Amino acid sequence: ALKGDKKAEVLARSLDSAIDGLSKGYMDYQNDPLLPLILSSIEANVKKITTLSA
Amino acid sequence: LSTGEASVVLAEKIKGITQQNDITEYGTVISIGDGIARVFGLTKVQAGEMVEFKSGIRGMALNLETDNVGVVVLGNDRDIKEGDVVKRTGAIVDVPIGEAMCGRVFDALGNPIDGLGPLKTTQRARVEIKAPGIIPRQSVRQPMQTGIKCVDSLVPIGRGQRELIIGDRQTGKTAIAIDTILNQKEAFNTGDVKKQLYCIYVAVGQKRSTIANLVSILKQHDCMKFTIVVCATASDAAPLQFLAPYSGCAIGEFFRDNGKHALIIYDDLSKQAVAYRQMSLLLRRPPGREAYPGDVFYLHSRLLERAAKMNDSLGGGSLTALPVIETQAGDVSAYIPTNVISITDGQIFLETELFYKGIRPAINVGLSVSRVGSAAQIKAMKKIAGNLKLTLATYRELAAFSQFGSDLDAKTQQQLNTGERLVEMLKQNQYTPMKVEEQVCIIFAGVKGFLDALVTSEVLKFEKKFLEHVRTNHSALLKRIRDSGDLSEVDTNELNTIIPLFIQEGGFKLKA
Amino acid sequence: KKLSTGEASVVLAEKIKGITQQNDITEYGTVISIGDGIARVFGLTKVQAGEMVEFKSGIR
Amino acid sequence: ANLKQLKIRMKAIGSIKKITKAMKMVA
Amino acid sequence: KANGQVSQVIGAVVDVQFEGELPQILNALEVQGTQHRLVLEVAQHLGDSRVRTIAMDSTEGLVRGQPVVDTGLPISVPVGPGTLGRIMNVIGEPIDQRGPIKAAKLYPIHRDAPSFTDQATSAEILVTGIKVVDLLAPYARGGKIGLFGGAGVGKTVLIQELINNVAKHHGGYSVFAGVGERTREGNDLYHEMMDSKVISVKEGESRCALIFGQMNEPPGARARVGLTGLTVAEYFRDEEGKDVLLFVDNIFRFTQACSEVSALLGRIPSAVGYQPTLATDLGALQERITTTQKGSITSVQAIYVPADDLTDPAPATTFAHLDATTVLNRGLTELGIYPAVDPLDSTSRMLDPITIGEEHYTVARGVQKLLQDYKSLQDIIAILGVDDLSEEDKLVVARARKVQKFLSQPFFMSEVFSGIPGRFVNLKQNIASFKALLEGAGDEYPESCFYMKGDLEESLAAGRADALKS
Amino acid sequence: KANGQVSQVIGAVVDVQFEGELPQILNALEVQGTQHRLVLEVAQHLGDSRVRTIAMDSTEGLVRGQPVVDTGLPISVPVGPGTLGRIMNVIGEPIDQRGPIKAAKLYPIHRDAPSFTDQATSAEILVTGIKVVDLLAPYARGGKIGLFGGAGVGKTVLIQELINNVAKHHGGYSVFAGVGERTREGNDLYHEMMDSKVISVKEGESRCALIFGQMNEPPGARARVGLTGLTVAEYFRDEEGKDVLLFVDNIFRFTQACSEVSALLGRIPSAVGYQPTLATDLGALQERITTTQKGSITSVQAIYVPADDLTDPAPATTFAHLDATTVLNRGLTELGIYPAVDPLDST
Amino acid sequence: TREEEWLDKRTKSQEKVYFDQEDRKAM
Amino acid sequence: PGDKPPAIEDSIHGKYAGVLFSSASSNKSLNKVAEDMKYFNQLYKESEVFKSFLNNVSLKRNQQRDIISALGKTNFNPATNNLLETLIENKRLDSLPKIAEKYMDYYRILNKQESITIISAQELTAAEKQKVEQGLKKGNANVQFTVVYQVDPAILGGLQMYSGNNFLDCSLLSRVNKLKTEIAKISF
Ligand SMILES: Nc1ncnc2c1ncn2[C@@H]1O[C@H](COP(=O)(O)OP(=O)(O)OP(=O)(O)O)[C@@H](O)[C@H]1O
Ligand SMILES: Nc1ncnc2c1ncn2[C@@H]1O[C@H](COP(=O)(O)OP(=O)(O)O)[C@@H](O)[C@H]1O
Ligand SMILES: Nc1ncnc2c1ncn2[C@@H]1O[C@H](COP(=O)(O)OP(=O)(O)O)[C@@H](O)[C@H]1O
Ligand SMILES: [Mg+2]
Ligand SMILES: [Mg+2]
Ligand SMILES: [Mg+2]
User: Fold this and answer.
1) Which of B105, B116, E146, E325 could form a disulfide with B229 if both were Cys (CB 3.0 to 4.6 A apart)?
2) Residue owning the nearest CA to atom 7 of ligand 2
3) Hey, what long-range contacts does C13-21 have (CB within 8 A, 24 or more apart)?
4) How far apart are CA H98 and CA H93, in angstroms?
5) Does the beta carbon of D9 lie under 8 angstroms from any beta carbon of chain G?
6) B371 is catalytic
7) What angle, 0 to 180 degrees and rounded to 10, lies between the N-to-C axes of helices A8-23 and H126-140?
């Protein structure tokens, strides 16, 4: 994700989430794209391994 | 647990990760030198609070002055520059604690230096915390077996006390600590949680090559699985050497408050006083006698006083401390050694003369003493331990008359010889811990006078042969002494009968 | 230098105001600091070494 | 160098020399 | 409404910035916003509405600008029977977890010593049950008692015996102030008094107060917790004419604690690093511990001798204030004699032929001279031996050893270590026992039986028993 | 650009006033307008754009306000096979009149000690030929060795014997570092080394480097000359990988040198006058002299016992860092026993 | 270098031997 | 504001600066003294001869008073004139510049205007910066401020604000490190 190949939305979403924190007293990453990106990859492996107890 | 179930919980855990950031005050450094950073502004900062510099190294705010703030650099201060930013974290110094700490090597701050992988821990406790009160404590009534004959017999150490390993350089101070850790490994293998003792070794101002050799020996004997090593080397900044003792101490409180038993071994504290003195002198504080700060006594007292035996209401846990002190020329009248002796319960004096005369471990029983006394020893040990002390006491007296010579009474020759057997008996090699039950048998044969038959040079080897002979043929005897913990009359008759018998069986020099 | 104990806030404040009122500087002084049984008194000119002085409470 | 130890050892030699000197008289 | 505010925090010293009406010195200030109650004692006025104080609790967690409240009075602690049988903190907090302390009123820990005209000194023998003490260094009821001992010499165990022997069966109350010592001993003593019924949970009982300033407390508290215990004894003295037994643990920690902060306070170190106010700080405490017209206080305070160096300024100045002195020697412990009371160094102001019976005074000096002569013979005996001595000197060495070993007495507190039950020796049996040995009553029997015995008769019985045994 | 200006000159400590972009600590600064170029290592940032530095050469001739140029990097000395058979200065300058040294790269004399992961035991005995040494305190190659002795006890003679028995037959390179010693021995050692064929002017020979911080150098030079020679040894350890014999003359001068300048730096004296950073400063120098997975460095370090007081803080703290110890006693020399080795003190 | 201990041990040693025999006769 | 400077310090320059601010703020005026002390700062750095005069310590008190009077007796607040007279009496004339600067610091603390600095790796577009103003404005919404820009960070696509003495981290770099650390301590 740090590299190119469709990194624009990552920075664009980071800016939006950044201004949100600045406007507020604190900063929380509820809209950060890094978390959903990582979960998507993890969920893929979970679905792959979760086939059957056999 | 099925692999799919565990993976789902793993993924769900990664999903629930929160990260909140709040406004953190920052200040500029007025000056930086020798690891001391004078900060401007940065008000509403707490004493001892953690602060982070531009490079990423942490700092501890110790001196809170109306004009500036005195901060100590917790690392290398080459990158720090005038006017740099200093962000306050808002939390007092702390370190990670838990069970995953065992089997790893960390630094004063708690970072693992083994290079294996990141530390997987979720519990972090404050380094400096108030010691237990009077009610939470409890009388020490559990033995802490070190594996040494002379120690477990003459200077018994009970879980929850404080024993001082004091001596000169290269007198076996570290050898004693290693032998204790090796002995506890056996109890760890067997399923007896009531006797498992987690070992913690705090290295302060020691060359990494020595610590590297130390860790290799533990892995060699497989005793590192229950050992925790905190490293504060000489290259490390003085604050690291100052916090490493308390840092490792907090790790011990984990097992203490959890009803478990932990053993913390503080290396030479004189090195801490130098680092603490250095840290105080550089802060422009008024020095005391020997250039040390005024509250240097409060340092070791606050550290050692935490070791105690928690009552059953809190789990019955215990933390045992074995601080070490290095003397320059065997002078115990110095300031730091005198204070530490008054803080701990007992102290183990190591003599250089005894070391070179073949008495290894070189232990001076005349001065060593323990407050717990026989309260920790087992029934089978107290009975034999009492007579052992009296016999050794007389031998030290007759030592002078040996030079006088020209005559020797029948009894004096016996007492002179009998004592010689005990001294030769208490000797022990390095990296060779002995089981408590095995010591009772050997120490028993000595006081009874059976060792007076064979020549002294054959007593040391007789010990090995006798123990091996017992383990094979007399196995039920060892079990009773271990389980019951008492030397019944039936065992005495059997033991009293085989010891004279075995000496005649084996090939020894019977001529006294 | 580092500082002078005689540079108290009360004495310096009077100078900045510009009022030349010392309240009989001679034969009278104002305590500036107290510690370990020794109290430093500003002013109190014309006092001889080893001479007795009376405090506000009455102690000598 | 720990004057207390040196002064004690000096006292010991003083007594030895004293008793040593006295034994010569009897000798 | 808090008038002051934190301005500087370094170690245990904390400075407060006040706007007006500065607090008097020794006043107690309450810091607001701390997780635990922190009290600051005013010590110096630095000018510009600044005051330097010492923290009683850990300074960690404080913050510059934190509001500070002025109480207007020095540290006040609860006094009265409610403190009897309860552990209390330097600032009066109950650390025994038994609930709040009920006190009829609060007295300050700082007060002026009683005048000289109303001193009302008196001498009265105190039978402590120890033969070596009651003979060579008799104690006076209502006078100070000093136990000079090194590190690990047996002064702590000796205090426990005095409590077991003196505190119990005492009409009046007792106070125990342990400052600077380890906390392990405190828990043991607390459980000991509970098992010994000296203290109990049932109200109206436990005629004994306990105060602890153990090492776990930071500097400043260990230097003032001693004053807290004294205030409790002073209450039981003035308000009620009841004899109070003040058992003070090692006091060197008091002077030591002051030196730990004396540097930060601005004082110049002394010859041995102590504070310049060592004499005055100690004098203010010793003068307050004395008998007056209202009541009497029998204070048993131990003095820790670091490195066995009696020339240290702290203990040296204490000798002048003590009535009875008990100097412990490390050599005796090596020999196995207990209590290891140095017979020559130990002295007692009551050791006067006019004060005590002439017979008691005679037997006392007879033993001192006997031991002094035996010590001089050690030199020649080392080279020549006991055989080369004359018949006159042989008898001196013979009886001297028997008397020296006979001084050893096993007490109840030493049973766990030795395994022999304690024993109590009366003053009459004590004087008569040694008087007989001086005349040669026991010169026939071996010197082995005159060891760890209570009375001479017990030694003779043991001698005959050993005969029939062989 | 000469952004710095000499603020004040006090003995060997010189302060420089800069307009902006202060140099990092340990950075090297060069004063302009003075023959025999002077190098100044940054030590502290006193504030207000003032930095306190230590002088390596005599400060006589400096003028307040004189410009100072900022190099932006610590003292970098040349390292490589060119230093072999060449004498270098505390600042890397050649003082043998042999020409410029040919070094591939210039490494800084300030570097962190090897981590805990990169450590090797190398428990192999080193036969030196001395029976008393090999018997009681046998030296092990790849470990740290320490020679304790007073004034005129046989420390130098013992070093010369080890060089004759070990260094000559040694295969890998060697490094000799002199700290606060008589220059005569440096000259005699250099000529003696040439005569023995251990070193020659022909390229490809002289598997040994020479470094000298003789007493003639002022404070600050004797305190960093060891780092210069040590850096030459670390190169052979890591890059070359072969064994190295790091011969270090009396090192007490290093600690002493720090004490001589600590007072000027504004530090509070230690128990007996030493600097409060004695343990840390010495430790950083000691932790770097250790065997790692790349190569081994058998260091023979001499320790001068001031006034024959082994309880002095400087030598006392050194024992904890040494593997093999050989304490020299003056009593034996009076009896005529040479080498005057104390068997009961040589651990 | 401890001569005071040497005399101390000599004193205790010889005295014990002398009185040990006397203890037998006394019994 | 209660004739109480922002902070109290025992330093030489700090002591005089605090007393002047309190005494000045006491009667009626604070800006008058501010302009006076500011004039000395500009003259202290612009005129070389004036710098040597203040730094000069071997000069006599009577001599210093004459040179000070020659400079100017009017246009300086009485607090400033009394301050100079005190320094001459206490030989603290050499510390004049530090006192002047320190005094302005306290006055600048009373000033409500503050400068906010935003640190961002990628260049801030004109339209993007406008949105930043609404966020900072809505955040405070009760104090005017001036914005400053500086783009030379090591983070990527991260925002870090510095507002006088407060720091709030909105950088993505902080998010990356946080997750990589928590994912490691899963202790599965
Ligand atoms: N009981 C022992 N049995 C056999 N050899 C021993 C024994 N004790 C020490 N040695 C030897 O002494 C050397 C190490 O001593 P050791 O480290 O145990 O003492 P030390 O006081 O910890 O030294 P230092 O203060 O320098 O750390 C080794 O050469 C070791 O073989
Ligand atoms: N009456 C005694 N007889 C024999 N040994 C004793 C006796 N009393 C104490 N010991 C020993 O003294 C030690 C305790 O010393 P202590 O009284 O605590 O000195 P301190 O007051 O300095 O703490 C214990 O190890 C205990 O075994
Ligand atoms: N192996 C030796 N055998 C006989 N005499 C020696 C020996 N070594 C030294 N001497 C003498 O000891 C003296 C001091 O030795 P040296 O190493 O120079 O001490 P220093 O460390 O002060 O330089 C020498 O001048 C030499 O005369
Ligand atoms: Mg060791
Ligand atoms: Mg005690
Ligand atoms: Mg030499």
Assistant:
1) B105
2) E414
3) C13/H19, C13/H22, C13/H23, C15/H82, C15/H85, C15/H86, C16/H19, C16/H20, C16/H23, C16/H24, C16/H79, C16/H82, C16/H83, C16/H86, C17/H23, C17/H26, C17/H82, C18/H78, C18/H82
4) 10
5) yes
6) yes
7) 30
